[PDB]
Design goal:
part of a larger assembly, 7 chains, A alpha+beta, B mainly alpha, C mainly alpha, E alpha+beta, A: seven-stranded mixed sheet, seven-stranded mixed sheet, 41 strands, 16% helix, globular, E: Gyrase A, domain 2, RNA Polymerase Alpha Subunit, Chain A, domain 2, four-stranded antiparallel sheet, 3 helices, binds magnesium ion, binds zinc ion, DNA-binding, protein dimerization activity (chain F), EC 2.7.7.6 (chain F), nucleotidyltransferase (chain F)
Amino acid sequence: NNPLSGLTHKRRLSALGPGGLSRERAGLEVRDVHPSHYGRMCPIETPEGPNIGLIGSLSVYARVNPFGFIETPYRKVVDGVVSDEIVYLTADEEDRHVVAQANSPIDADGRFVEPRVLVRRKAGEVEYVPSSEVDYMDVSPRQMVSVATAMIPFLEHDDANRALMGANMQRQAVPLVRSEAPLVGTGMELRAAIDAGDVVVAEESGVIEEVSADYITVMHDNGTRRTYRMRKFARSNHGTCANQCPIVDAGDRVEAGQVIADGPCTDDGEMALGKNLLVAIMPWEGHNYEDAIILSNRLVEEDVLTSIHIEEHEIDARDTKLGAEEITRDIPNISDEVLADLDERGIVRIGAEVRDGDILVGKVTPKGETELTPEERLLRAIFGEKAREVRDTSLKVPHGESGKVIGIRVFSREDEDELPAGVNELVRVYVAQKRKISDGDKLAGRHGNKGVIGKILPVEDMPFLADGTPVDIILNTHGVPRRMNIGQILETHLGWCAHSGWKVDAAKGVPDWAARLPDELLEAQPNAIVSTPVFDGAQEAELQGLLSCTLPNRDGDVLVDADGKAMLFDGRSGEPFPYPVTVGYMYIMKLHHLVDDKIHARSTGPYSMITQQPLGGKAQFGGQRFGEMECWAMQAYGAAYTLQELLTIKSDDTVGRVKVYEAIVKGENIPEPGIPESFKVLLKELQ
Amino acid sequence: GYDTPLGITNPPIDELLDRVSSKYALVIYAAKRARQINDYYNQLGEGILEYVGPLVEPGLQEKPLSIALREIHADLLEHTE
Amino acid sequence: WLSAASFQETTRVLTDAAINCRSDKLNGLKENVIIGKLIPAGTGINRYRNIAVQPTEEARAA
Amino acid sequence: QCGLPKLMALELFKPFVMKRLVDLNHAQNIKSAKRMVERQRPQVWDVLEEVIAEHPVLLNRAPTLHRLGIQAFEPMLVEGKAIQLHPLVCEAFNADFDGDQMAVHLPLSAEAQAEARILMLSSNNILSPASGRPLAMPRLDMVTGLYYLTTEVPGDTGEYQPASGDHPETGVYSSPAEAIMAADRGVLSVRAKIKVRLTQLRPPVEIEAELFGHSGWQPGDAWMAETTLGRVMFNELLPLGYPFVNKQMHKKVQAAIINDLAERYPMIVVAQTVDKLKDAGFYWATRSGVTVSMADVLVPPRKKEILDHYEERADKVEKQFQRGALNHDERNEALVEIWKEATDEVGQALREHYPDDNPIITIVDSGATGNFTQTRTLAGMKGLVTNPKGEFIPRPVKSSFREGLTVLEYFINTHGARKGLADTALRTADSGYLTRRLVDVSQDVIVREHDCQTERGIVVELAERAPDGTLIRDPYIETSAYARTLGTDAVDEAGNVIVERGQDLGDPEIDALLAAGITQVKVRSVLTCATSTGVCATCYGRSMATGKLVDIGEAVGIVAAQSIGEPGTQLTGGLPRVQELFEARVPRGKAPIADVTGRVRLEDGERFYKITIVPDDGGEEVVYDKISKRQRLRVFKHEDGSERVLSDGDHVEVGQQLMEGSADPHEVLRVQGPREVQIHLVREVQEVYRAQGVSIHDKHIEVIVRQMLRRVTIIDS
Amino acid sequence: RPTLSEDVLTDNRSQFVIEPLEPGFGYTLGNSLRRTLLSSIPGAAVTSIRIDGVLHEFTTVPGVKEDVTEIILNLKSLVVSSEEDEPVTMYLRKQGPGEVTAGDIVPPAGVTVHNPGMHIATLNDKGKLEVELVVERGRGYVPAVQNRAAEIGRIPVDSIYSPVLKVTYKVDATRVEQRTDFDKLILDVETKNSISPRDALASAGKTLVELFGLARELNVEAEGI
Amino acid sequence: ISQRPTLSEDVLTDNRSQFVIEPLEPGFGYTLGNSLRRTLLSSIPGAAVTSIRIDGVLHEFTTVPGVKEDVTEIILNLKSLVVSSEEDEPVTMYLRKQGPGEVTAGDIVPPAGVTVHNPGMHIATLNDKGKLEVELVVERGRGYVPAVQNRASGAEIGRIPVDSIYSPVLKVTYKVDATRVEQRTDFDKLILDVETKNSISPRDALASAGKTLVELFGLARELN
Amino acid sequence: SNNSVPGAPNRVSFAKLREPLEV
DNA sequence: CATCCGTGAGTCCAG
Ligand SMILES: [Mg+2]
Ligand SMILES: [Zn+2]
């Protein structure tokens, strides 16, 4: 789906598989978080379903030792003094030793501050221990987490249930037409993008000799030239769009290991799973009720939340017993109006637009010479039109799909292309869709705050700040303190600070709250990026203070207060809202669950081969299932006819469903249901 | 005493239930008359002796059910179990 | 046996039924749903199923 | 209504649209009509709008746990590709909007549509068939919105002021239309107490009699009230003919109103009324100013003070175990208590320090959503965490989430949180399997008759007897008596009968039996009423959904099954106990019962418990042998003191449970007989759902139990 | 398509229906029109009163059923049209057993009472009543504290100048062509016995045209109806 | 208790202008200025690009040889283009530049009655050997019209339909000074703020807003 | 700065100094 | 009261 998703895949740790255990055999012990998992296996990252606890992610700093166990880095302490010498310890090895926590205060030389410090001991037991007895200490605070876990700002403010989803959803983010880095980060966003392998890094240092949309050419120091080719509009496994664009301009001095061209969900080499949205935490006319989400039409018009999706359609020409399938522009009984967007071969032309039901690859096959209908024979003598022996077997666009034809790939057996035994010509047609955001589309933050788009209001209906700026997204207040994920609150506060900028007051000295604050942050520009590393980063003290330091807008007016709230005007009534509303900036990702995929419906269609019941799935144009649980509800209603109807004529009554169609289009009444063909199968299976 | 019923809530079911033993009965009582009405329209085109037409003024493009369900409210139909 | 075989231990249900030559009277909810009859409940019972509806004698073609 | 996407509808009514396409000559035949719908010509969007006219559809949302998982709606065409759903039916489908999907089924036949609009329509199924309570009620934004305006704010502006000095009475308005133009200018607060003359709202029952003598209030009759402008606009929804309510609208309050509307007023009034309430709540939830900021979430002032007090008490316990004066099992058992007490004191710190303005608190205490224990975990402290065993960890999490939890705190917290998720996954699988067993055992159970006519029933304890005097309402009243029909005239001390036989028990009729002093009524049950196949109507009584007598032919057997297995997820005996009973297993507890009634002869030994019973009526001594791990049950003796544990010389009735645990119902059968064992089951079953806050009317339990006794064994051929 | 104007009636009030508005204009026209009818239409009402047998408010007027409170309220609902802007004064005196109405009022020249059947106060035998009324002109609604200034029993009254009593509005969507976005504006308006609702709207409609003239005067560039 | 016809003052800046309106009814200013803000943002007429055509390009998703940017990013750069046209009917602009250098909105060639208000706008960074030939169609309209509508008309396989943001309004707000002093001196003073796109004037925007509204409220005066 | 190693955009970090080892 | 074999262990979706 995105770069990060691929990375997470390469680091997943499964118990499932041959030689391992089954899902049913696994009890409640195998799944829960073990004390040894510290710094080796992430305790947050795991699936939410029946797979839970059986699938995890390898921790950030850990590595695998030549015996197949999981080691992890710890800092060595000789005698109360931290040493930069690092040794990797296995799980049982760590048990024999005693580990101090990472955040324990350390002398500038390397000594401990307090005699008794926080200590990790075998069997997951904790106690205070004099500094004389400390063997090792942790490498980093964020040592226990995975790569996906670490990108959740203010993680220690979100409960393990929403933090879990927060990590399990980042993988599900869709690459956008163009991507922005988040205003609020944790620092991980850089290394993650680079290691993923869906960006372009410079191997050897040098200078940009020539740059194009197609490729980048780098002139090394030693004289040799290495050229990197850009992936442009390529279909991913999941139909998302991996499109790389050069960062550097021609003649730029570039050093080795630097990002010169990023890919999908990447801004200047940083993981960019979403956009920076102006949020407003208030109920609004019941349209954001029960985790629904309200949008500004701005996000539609400015393609802020827009993405491309590419499909791969395929079809072949085989040898049959009645001859051989040939791909031709001549399809029986079709106007030249439909064949308009075809070339002389029979294939669609690049650049053409295609809708559902339209022709992509016109292929015809010889049909069996069976005695044609005496009623159709008669109909062919009147109009004197001799029947062709070729049946239409063309590739038409599946229901729902649509877009521009962005490439054709032809393989011919004639042109020596090695095809499987029996095939002659094989055509692939790639169609892309520029899907704008719409109602029902699933949006999410990093803190397990999901939701689908309820209503997209016109830009003027939006509750706006004093200077006229209309907000972007209107999250409901009710669904915040229940989920124990108030990180989204802290992200919003710091988000406004990161957008307006700030300046701490240095007059009468550096304030006591911003005393621990690093010098570089004491003054900030509008639209500035920051890092809030997990188990470190901003504290609620510094955050409250920064709300006071918020720089005024272009009109010299402050917009939000020290509470972090601001006054809103209802874009509908005009009257300003009676109470202060929490307003700020929050990072939101467009997840890969869009209505344009999810919607499906069926009148009639194909049917099963044995049970003669309707097939199942959107890919098979199937019908829904009225299961055993759903029958009980009908019976509990007393709707005997509705229940009978569904399981009879609407399903596997061979003669029924045929005579129901007739009765409807002729505008008559529905006939009495017959015998289920599936039941007839049972009596034969018993016999 | 209430607000004017709209759409599929009309005729009000409470007064519809008063003219019938139970909920279940009201269903068959109504749908069987809807069959008579839809028969009448198809049969009339080519056949005499059809079931008696709509005893009330049909709404423009009114469903056969919605016609039946209205004359149940008008007590113009007889009820047999 | 139909309502029993469609519950649990089907292979045990059949073997026993076939020995005793058990005959099932299709008069039950699970039984009827399978064969596709109208279920013996709600709007499916004869009390409500066999109903005759007629216009009142007072109601007459204009 | 529901929102059916224009793309979805065209495929659902596909052979219906082709019909009217060849009707209005847009197509020459049926083959062309097909090509017009497939090509999606602009004509069909006009044709389709006619086809779906009042033609209902079904909305299904898996898992379909109860029969409200499928409801009928009036489909409305809508742009977009998403199904639009009425906010109130969310409680029925248990549907949120985090990416939920629903299945739509289109009824074809003449009967199917009839069953849809009548039986399955959403505006008819307002009530849960389990308890008779309103599911389609103000729930989240709505409740907080209404709770807003109906709150009486003391010193708010525009408030009524008495006359004194040179200024007359301030705060009196002639009409609602005047008070409306007041807040528009900005003089009156919609939540400030005032006095207004009302012309279109019936006054309270207590005041209507004082001002009219129940002459019959009339639209036009005037009267004075002391409310807030908000509470007036709220009563304009109930609407006319309903006595004025001068309270703030907590959810329990609004639950009562709708429930009352369910009893008296017709269905279409309720559906139209609850719609009005929805609109109100959302409009006022918007301007309610309910917002979450870092500011509104405040850590307690005595935070570090309170924690230091108990940590000191803790260190004392640590040193007291350091000298080994305390047992290891006692050490933690005490450390648990210390921190359990601490967390409470932190919660107390919040409530008082938090203003009732505070939105976090506002939502919690208004029954809108959430618990205060969540608020405590949020701003106070997490508290104790659960061990892999389930025992509470001696170590506490002193950090709240607002302050950010420490690293090793997060780890052990995470451990518990996941095992919670793990078990939440496994119980669902069980709960579902329990559900399907129940469905199958009670499928042939249908209402086939109107009345068995048997006078047989069962007693129900209406209320406890206060020691000082008077009467105390029984806690089982709502689930054991309220829906029943009488099987014997209920008389007081006099010869005057209060409620006849064949009379449905309603809310007032209970009060009639509550005030009269009678504390026991014999009522008809599904257990007693014997009929050929299935059960009668009369005995079953009020169908919890309809609020009237159950219709003849209702699949009460399946609905009973559903109603028990639907909430069966929320348990900790636990769900195994619920199985253990329904599957009639010889229990783990194996607590013995008295074979014959008489005097108890306790003769305990340290190695083994032994109980002997001297027969009250002659007889020969009966003696049992018990393991010392169990303990004697505190049975309510003749002394009317339940807390009296078993002692020698005590008197026990026949079948009286001797020790704690559970009685083997098989013994209860041979000892106390078929009828008694049925009532033991039902209440022992009930006690499991009671403990977790689940309320199923005894009705549904009995339908299953009845089916457990239909067979007798063959002793002699 | 050009927008239509409709009317469903009642003697004192009526509903108005506007459609089809360009999408998003239902709310653009809604609240703006309401506050206009409730505040931007001039009339005549009672500023203050004076009662003979009153030196303080808590005691009721000797010989009268109603308290001092309920009579004021009764008087607030009195509809009056004065011809001159400047404050006039009318007298209402009656004695003996019976009921005093708005028809008993003695009005000055150019001042008309429109509901002479309105109940005011129930006088019993030996019951004397003499009241001095102060009638001014204005718009909308004005509080009583602003009318707190003969100090021998002067009573400040809530001034309801506006002839429009109460207005509510809802905005639904009409499906024009294929677009289901267009807005339909429903507007409920209740007026006094002084002016008809159908007329009150036109004046409220004419009033607002004057405001949007100022902007239009500059260029009158572009618009299409 | 006072009567005064209202005014409409103005305090200017090049791109944005404050309009002052007083004296208004008490608590009337808020719901008046908003009635203007909602008119400006939505229904003010202007002009922008509807469709384009590029040499050697057949669809939106590709790359021109020797150009640093791809067509999508180029089309996304062209959204920012500020254009005013008088021609009520569609017109055609042009842009052709070769060799090294940077192409801008200045290199566009607007026909009679079409003016580009932001020539410094970066479009594409053309490297050596890079050639770019485009062809832009501009129309007149209001609000926002999605590209998707252009394609089904009958447009050839060359054209690439582009979204149209006609609204020449940028950012609008208001503030109100209500004298709530207990007297007949109670009124509301409105201060409207309008910022444009330098395609039209802040005044001319308020003029087309008023012309619109007047024609809407005029139907409230016509008799039955 | 956080990761001053490749040539990356500067993201200012609230932090205790983290110099044990790069990811 | 404890062993050995056979049979149970949520739904819908996609794929
Ligand atoms: Mg959900
Ligand atoms: Zn019975």
